[PDB]
Amino acid sequence: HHHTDPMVSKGEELFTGVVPILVELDGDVNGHKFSVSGEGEGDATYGKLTLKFICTTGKLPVPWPTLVTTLVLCFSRYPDHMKQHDFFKSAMPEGYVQERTIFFKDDGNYKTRAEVKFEGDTLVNRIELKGIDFKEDGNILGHKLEYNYNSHNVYIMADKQKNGIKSNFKIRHNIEDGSVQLADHYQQNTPIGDGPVLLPDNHYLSTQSKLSKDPNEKRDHMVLLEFVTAAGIT
Fold first, then answer.
1. Which residue, 19, 104, 201, 219, shows the most beta carbons closer than 10 Å to its own?
2. Residue 64: CATH number of its domain
3. Ramachandran quadrant class, 117 (left: phi over 0; alpha: psi -120 to 50; beta: rest)
4. How many domains does the chain have?
5. DSSP letters along 53-68, please?
6. CA dist 202 to 68, 74, 77, 232, Å?
7. Residue 147 in domain
8. Distance CA 37, CA 24 (A)
9. For residues 113-151, b (16+ Cβ closer than 10 Å) or e, as one string?
10. Complete DSSP assignment for 188-213
11. Gyration radius of the chain's alpha carbons
């Protein structure tokens, strides 16, 4: 609402209230083609997301928790003293590309590319996902993961050469038998536009996610509440 840096003001202004979100994913995992649509709202003031996702092609062929990181970090809450480090909002409204490779230990990998940008007043995240080399009897295609999600801190670093950011981090998915399925993420983000962006000092994001079901919904779906806060600069 009041920042002495006009570049920060420009990005904050687009995220000042509740912003509607649309998520589209087209996926192919070991030749099972599927699509997911999601709708909800983001409130960057509190770092809060609320989304509901539907598999529009029938039953989702992989477990919903494996898609949480893939299915909008511009809604992170950056403390006032860290707002000059917020790459994600500084790239708006033209947006950014978010690319990942996700390696599931002892199993296959996801390769994702997403464009995150405004269409009018709506923040859209449009994703293509390709998954290969998964085991039919593994934890992913065998749906052995529990329907829950662990809190996680992720380290963000600038990539000055690409005018973007980079991160590598591990997600632990609980398996029904009490064990864990590791998912190693590599991520890079680059701006879509050619204007300047804020390139951050090293810092981390703290995330927490809660998964639930809509008791009146017959389609395969996931309801997601996420909180993300930046930290690590004193």
1. 104
2. 2.40.155.10
3. beta
4. 1
5. EEETTSS-SS-GGGGT
6. 24, 17, 16, 8
7. yes
8. 5
9. ebebbeeeeebbbbbebebeebeeeebbbeebbeeebee
10. EEEESSSS--PPPPSEEEEEEEEEE-
11. 17
